[PDB]
């Protein structure tokens, strides 16, 4: 297994996302080996349902000389919003498709802003439909506009790879600069510009607490899934969230009928904690390497509000709405502040909001959450920025 990289095509409708996706898959198959996909196979995106939220996504796979890519393409504007806000497709990089004829358009800007909000780490640009523009100064002008638009949202527009091509020429089997060579140039940009994502085992240790036990003859044990890093018996951990942060030592690690020396990312296990009582640990707190994650009550978020068809509200909510925010394992009530001038949010919409929780939660930007009322999911969010 070589590097596996998650990517996707973003950009305004009709700018050439599905055509480019089909061209990449077909040309990589012909060049490096794999399966070719045509336009109709990718334009028809299957439906996959998870928590009532319906997202239509097309998934294609293709190989570079050294990597295997998983690529997502979406039919509608709402599909891209839901896919990016939730953790459905965790893109390691996004391919921004922009038509050289019309230039950046409203959904071009929204998709860059969304990528910033949800934490898309890198963006590569395919400047498409260059077969329709013969003036190279006009191509330069639109490229400059795309780079500046990227920098407006804190992406490094001056260093961004911008590949000029015609996804339709490439899919049709054309040669020349805008044909197959341009799609191979884009694949070479994916290989050179997007690093392999850091392994969970290499990150700082983090384990959300799911259950707590007072075991007679042993002491206090917390159970959960290790999300990141490694914890060894004898090392210190912080208990972060809900209550003031405290620090203790791990004195044991175990799985069912298996005593362990350490707990590793992906493992579900129990952790024995020195000098701790059951009332000091609780669900919704996390164990973490000391000093690597901080509790917060205030944060900004990007939020998709479920439509009534997805089991959400069928009425708008107002500024000052106080639902529950479900973080990892538990609900915390929080008050919502909308952008200035915004008084209500419609179901089916996505908005940027500020939140103040009634108790702190350990969080970094990129943490996903659900918004619930009465235990019914009414929204999905991602922490865009922690307020301090």
Residue ranges that bind ligand GDP, judged by CB under 6 A: 13-19, 128-129, 131-132, 166-169
53 is in the binding site of which of Mg ion, ligand GDP, none (Cβ under 5 to 8 A by kind)?
none
Binding partner of residue 128 among Mg ion, ligand GDP, none, CB cut-off 5 to 8 Å per kind: ligand GDP
Token pair for 351: 């908005």
Instruction: Give the CA radius of gyration of the chain.
Output: 23
Query: Which of 19/276 has CB closer to ligand GDP?
Result: 19
For residues 169 and 124, give the distance between their C-alpha atoms in angstroms, rounded to a whole number.
20
* Best CA proximity match to 207, nearest among 270, 280, 291, 275: 270
Task: Find which of Mg ion, ligand GDP, none residue 13 binds, CB within 5 to 8 Å per kind.
Answer: ligand GDP
- CA angle 165-113-121, nearest 5°? 70
Residue with smaller CB distance to ligand GDP, 55 or 168: 168
Half-sphere exposure of 148 (CA within 13 A, CB side): 8
In the complex, minimum distance from the CB of residue 57 to ligand GDP, in angstroms, rounded to a whole number? 13
Which residue's beta carbon is nearest to the bound Mg ion? Answer: 18
- Considering the complex, state which of residue 165 and residue 295 has its C-beta at the smaller distance from Mg ion: 165
* 169 or 383: CB nearest ligand GDP: 169
Residue 18 in contact with Mg ion, rule: CB under 5 A: yes
Instruction: Output phi, psi for 132, to 5 deg.
Output: -100, -5
Nearer to Mg ion, 17 or 289 (CB): 17
The residues assigned a catalytic role are 14, 17-18, 77
Edge-first strand order for the sheet with 4-10 is 58-63, 68-73, 4-10, 93-99, 123-128, 162-164
CB of 73 to Mg ion, least distance (A): 6
**Minimum Å distance from CB 170 to ligand GDP?**
8
Q: Which does residue 15 touch among ligand GDP, Mg ion, none (CB within 5 to 8 A, set by kind)?
A: ligand GDP
Query: 252-278 burial, b if ≥16 CB within 10 A, otherwise e?
Result: bbeeeeeebebbbbebebbbbbeebee
Q: Does 83 bind Mg ion (CB under 5 A)?
A: no
140 is written with which tokens? 């330069």
* Residue 235: C-alpha distances to residues 94, 327, 363 (Å): 39, 26, 22
Shortest distance, CB of residue 111 to Mg ion, whole angstroms? 13
CB of 207 to Mg ion, least distance (A): 40
Residues that bind Mg ion (CB under 5 A): 17-18
């Amino acid at each position: 297994n070589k590097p596996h990289v998650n990517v996707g095509t973003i950009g305004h409708v009709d700018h050439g996302k599905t055509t480019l996706t089909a061209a990449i898959a077909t040309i990589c198959a012909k060049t490096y080996g794999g399966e070719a996909k045509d336009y109709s196979q990718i334009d028809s995106a299957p439906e996959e349902k998870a928590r009532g939220i319906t997202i239509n996504t097309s998934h294609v796979e293709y190989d570079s000389p050294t990597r295997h890519y998983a690529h997502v393409d979406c039919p509608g504007h709402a599909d891209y919003v839901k896919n990016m806000i939730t953790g459905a497709a965790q893109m390691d990089g996004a391919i921004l498709v922009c038509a050289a004829t019309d230039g950046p358009m409203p959904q071009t800007r929204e998709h860059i802003l969304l990528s910033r909000q949800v934490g898309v780490p890198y963006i590569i640009v395919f400047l498409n439909k260059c077969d329709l523009v013969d003036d190279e100064e006009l191509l330069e002008l639109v490229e400059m506009e795309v780079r500046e638009l990227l920098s407006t949202y804190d992406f490094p527009g001056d260093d961004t790879p911008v590949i000029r091509g015609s996804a339709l020429a490439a899919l049709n089997g054309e040669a020349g600069p805008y044909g197959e060579e341009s799609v191979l140039a884009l694949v070479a940009a994916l290989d050179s510009y997007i690093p392999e994502p850091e392994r969970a085992i290499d990150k700082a240790f983090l384990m959300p607490i799911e259950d707590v036990f007072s075991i007679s003859g042993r002491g206090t044990v917390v159970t959960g899934r290790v999300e990141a890093g490694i914890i060894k018996v004898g090392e210190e951990v912080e208990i972060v969230g809900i209550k003031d942060t405290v620090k203790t030592t791990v004195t044991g690690v175990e799985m069912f009928r298996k005593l362990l020396d350490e707990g590793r990312a992906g493992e579900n296990c129990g952790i024995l904690l020195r000098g701790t009582k059951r009332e000091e640990v609780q669900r919704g707190q996390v164990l973490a390497k000391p000093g690597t994650i901080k509790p917060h009550t205030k944060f900004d978020a990007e939020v998709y509000v479920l439509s009534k068809e997805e089991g959400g509200r069928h009425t708008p909510f107002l500024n000052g709405y106080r639902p529950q925010f479900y973080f990892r394992t538990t609900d915390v009530t929080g008050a919502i502040q909308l952008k200035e001038g915004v008084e209500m949010v419609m179901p089916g919409d996505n908005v940027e909001m500020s939140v103040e929780l009634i108790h702190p939660i350990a969080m970094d930007p990129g943490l996903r959450f659900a918004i619930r009322e009465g235990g019914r999911t009414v929204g999905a969010g991602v922490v865009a920025k922690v307020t301090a």
